[PDB]
Design a protein around this ligand. Structure first.
Ligand SMILES: NC(=O)c1ccc[n+]([C@@H]2O[C@H](COP(=O)([O-])OP(=O)(O)OC[C@H]3O[C@@H](n4cnc5c(N)ncnc54)[C@H](O)[C@@H]3O)[C@@H](O)[C@H]2O)c1
Ligand SMILES: NC(=O)c1ccc[n+]([C@@H]2O[C@H](COP(=O)([O-])OP(=O)(O)OC[C@H]3O[C@@H](n4cnc5c(N)ncnc54)[C@H](O)[C@@H]3O)[C@@H](O)[C@H]2O)c1
Ligand SMILES: NC(=O)c1ccc[n+]([C@@H]2O[C@H](COP(=O)([O-])OP(=O)(O)OC[C@H]3O[C@@H](n4cnc5c(N)ncnc54)[C@H](O)[C@@H]3O)[C@@H](O)[C@H]2O)c1
Ligand SMILES: NC(=O)c1ccc[n+]([C@@H]2O[C@H](COP(=O)([O-])OP(=O)(O)OC[C@H]3O[C@@H](n4cnc5c(N)ncnc54)[C@H](O)[C@@H]3O)[C@@H](O)[C@H]2O)c1
Ligand SMILES: Nc1ncnc2c1ncn2[C@@H]1O[C@H](COP(=O)(O)OP(=O)(O)O)[C@@H](O)[C@H]1O
Ligand SMILES: Nc1ncnc2c1ncn2[C@@H]1O[C@H](COP(=O)(O)OP(=O)(O)O)[C@@H](O)[C@H]1O
Lengths: 251, 251, 251, 251
């Protein structure tokens, strides 16, 4: 019962890590708000969890007015917010020469503005509960990739905003951390050519992709009392990916 | 002259480190495009430099339409672009709880969008000259501050965009690097109280604020042949600030 | 019990975070080997734990002959090794100009050699259990201090040895990670003056020193199944210390 | 004449980067001490440089008594030391399971003790000239490699000792920085199988190995007045290697 009666708001709750986060927190006694643009996935997850202990909601995290209303209505209806998981995301592939101003606006709106807005509007509620924030960043926020320029800029914004907010609020009893996953098994990635999955298994020392549960576990730890002295941290959940200096594996 | 007949585009060239960069590159033979939204300031710097070797451009770098036009106009008139200094920036002080959505739009528009747009629209021209980009990020992009949340997110994006674009374009002969200053003596920090400045002399092991010329020296180095194997680097120009683990002096 | 019948070897187990780790793992069902060169201290901790579930080993971990023997003796008697906590450490204060070659030999022998030897001689046993290593490094290994030069070099080695061994062994089912505390309330720092401790409450955003139990909590997490995809990570347990760019508070 | 009449002591002066460093500094007016275990290479380089402006000397940098005598004799004979280049090195290949205690002693003696000892004994001389230190670290000190455990520990010690010493001495006017090269063209590496050199050209965005001159250039910059505000920095000279989060290049 690590999260007994704690109110956990999950943005991007309809993706693999979002759903694994929702089930892990629920299993540990949390009341879970599954917030997402899309309705089907979060409605199905919410319906699968204990009645009265899960609600699905529509949100555009790129919309600060909608975000502010969502955060106040959750606090009004459930009386508290204890945990924010900023798990919404969009990915676009390409260099800045292969990706449009529009692509940049899309990445920035969800991957940066979403973290800024949901953290700003949850914080007054988190300050009352001495709750915490866990951002879903990425190894792509700790270092660059080939062919994901906008994505790397945005997750780099999330990684450093995590540090800055942690300094601003940690002394008022609200810890702010991120998880920085590498390759996570979804149907997107299960479908990838074998040649591509092999290149990931070579660069990742554990030699496999993460299960979404393996990332949700770290999110749950970082929201737990055991993480009482972890603040402003960007935890690589990457089987060793970012532990390399970038030099090739030779035997 | 290290920069003899090289076209150097410098955003935020009307003041501080941009101005110091304009004088240093001009002294070393560069033709300098001075871009700024402070029309009088940038006109004065432009006019102070050798006739026919400097042109002022009145531009808000947050405007992708204006930026695209400037980069193509410069290329047409001067026949080339060798160096982009993404130096234009604005600061705002406070946590996300003390700074408005409008403060965020101002920070993100100049400090992220301006870097993204100027990089994107210069790059086709830099690919022809095998030129380079030097972003002015900040130590505020390599880690967090207390009370500059939006600025830290923005410079966070600049730091990781520097890495990603370096991976994308280095193989095509275009190096992308940043300088990451700590306290520099400019209009951006001239209002900051004495007790904060005194704490900077403690946290910076060199025991003083930087002169703008000291950062312009590193921008010139990073645009030089001597930096031919430096790519995707965020060079701290901070007198040791980021070298510290954040702990106070042990003795 | 998360660690039911797991053999956990803990260096520096007679005091501070090693002791707290011994109690936490023991509480969670571990059989604990308590290694220390403080024979009375480690005997007292060992004797305080459940009978037949703890053994004290009087060892100087800087001694590769003694370390090789302990690791093989433990494996013989207990039939397995599941977890190594490389926690033993000594501190010395000063620049290289104020600390002797003998100070360096003491720092390097315990703080680097001891980690290297214990890791090397445990690893054949951890490969059989698909166990893990948790190094106790320091924020003093992720960046510099004023006046702990030798200690910073040593913890520097621990941090990057953690990354390299993670790449070497993660694919064989052995995860290698560190915890990087800042100020923790132990014998190592109990002599440090009040003015320095007060500065720590400023530089640590949580505004307090860590309890040893708060670091032992993260060691237990990193040795747990919930850390199944964390490998080669240097987890800061520093209340935000390393999240800062080193600058003093901006407001 | 950037280094006119400045006394530059280069350890490891007989290797590719050592010789390129010696020629670059000499070209800029330096008086160069070429210090190395081996005699032939440094004698030949010294004999090739202006008479009265270069001397070759034997040193074991693993020997603190010999190092201390060398530093005092250079200061006695030439009257000053302005620059230390800590460029001595030994590499060993393998995990900790493939490399002996002896291998560790060899790596630690030259790659750590050499930097500690030469910096300790030069410093009193550098404090009189407000000179500087440039450590030859490695990307292998900024992150791990597969199959170089001891090497990664040692260069990780050099990277963090650089930070610590920079904090200790930068306020007394002695800046301390490192260069962190990746693959550098030598005959060792020119001879490598094409399959291995291809894997380096893939991970390095510039798509090639560094010339030793490209690393020497960065050493010369970091010792120059242009680097007046760079202190405690570990400059990647790696064509982008460490700019990657470790994820594979996919197209
Ligand atoms: N001063 C410091 O201590 C410090 C520290 C770290 C980094 N920086 C960065 O250094 C860069 C230069 O700032 P500075 O300290 O020289 O300040 P400054 O005020 O002296 O100069 C900044 C210049 O940028 C221009 N500018 C701002 N927004 C613009 C826009 N939208 N379009 C065009 N021009 C614009 C301003 O008019 C001004 O001339 C910024 O990116 C800043 O964030 C400053
Ligand atoms: N949207 C825009 O077009 C826009 C927005 C911001 C500012 N600007 C331009 O910036 C310029 C200044 O406007 P502002 O409101 O930012 O300015 P301001 O009056 O706030 O002054 C800007 C900075 O200059 C410093 N300063 C004052 N006197 C100075 C002097 N003699 N020399 C150098 N620095 C001096 C101030 O202390 C301050 O740090 C104008 O040209 C304005 O058009 C453009
Ligand atoms: N206390 C802090 O603020 C702090 C901060 C960061 C990291 N650390 C690290 O935490 C670890 C634990 O230290 P602590 O703070 O719990 O101190 P402590 O003094 O409470 O415990 C350290 C223990 O290690 C033992 N030890 C030392 N050298 C040994 C050797 N050669 N062989 C065997 N045992 C040996 C000591 O006898 C002692 O029991 C160390 O590696 C230390 O560097 C301490
Ligand atoms: N070469 C070796 O074998 C070696 C070297 C160092 C110490 N040790 C062992 O460490 C132990 C202590 O020796 P030392 O000289 O390091 O000790 P010490 O007298 O310096 O005390 C060690 C630490 O314990 C603290 N302390 C004092 N009273 C305490 C108490 N009642 N409970 C808990 N902590 C207390 C002290 O303030 C100090 O921080 C001995 O068992 C000694 O054999 C081993
Ligand atoms: N504007 C938005 N507001 C709220 N949630 C959003 C928004 N944009 C994307 N999301 C959600 O973020 C989650 C993560 O997106 P993504 O990383 O693309 O997941 P997946 O790869 O599994 O499709 C999704 O559930 C998606 O619907
Ligand atoms: N104990 C030592 N004292 C002084 N110089 C040393 C010592 N050990 C190695 N060196 C020198 O360090 C330099 C760099 O070594 P290394 O990296 O192996 O160079 P290379 O790969 O070109 O042979 C060499 O010139 C070598 O002789």
């Amino acid at each position: 019962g690590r999260f007994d009666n704690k109110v956990v708001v999950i943005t991007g709750a309809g993706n693999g890590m979002g759903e694994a986060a929702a089930r892990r927190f629920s299993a540990e006694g949390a009341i879970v708000v599954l917030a997402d643009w899309a309705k089907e996935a979060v409605d199905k997850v919410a319906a699968s969890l204990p009645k009265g202990r899960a609600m699905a909601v529509h949100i555009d995290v790129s919309d600060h007015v909608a975000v502010e209303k969502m955060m106040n209505e959750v606090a009004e209806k459930l009386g508290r917010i204890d945990v924010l998981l900023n798990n919404a995301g969009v990915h676009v592939a390409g260099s800045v020469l292969e990706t449009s101003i529009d692509d940049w606006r899309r990445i920035a709106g969800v991957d940066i503005d979403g973290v800024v807005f949901c953290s700003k509007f949850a914080l007054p509620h988190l300050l009352k509960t001495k709750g915490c924030i866990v951002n879903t960043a990425s190894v792509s926020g700790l270092g660059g990739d080939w062919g994901a320029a906008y994505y790397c800029a945005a997750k780099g914004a999330v990684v450093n905003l995590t540090r800055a907010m942690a300094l601003d609020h940690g002394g008022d009893g609200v810890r702010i951390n991120s998880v920085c996953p590498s390759l996570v098994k979804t149907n997107m990635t299960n479908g990838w050519p074998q040649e591509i999955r092999d290149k990931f298994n070579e660069r990742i020392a554990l030699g496999r992709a993460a299960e979404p549960e393996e990332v949700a576990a770290v999110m749950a730890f970082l929201a737990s009392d055991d993480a009482s002295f972890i603040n402003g941290a960007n935890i690589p959940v990457d089987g060793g990916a970012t532990a390399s200096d970038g030099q090739p594996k030779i035997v």
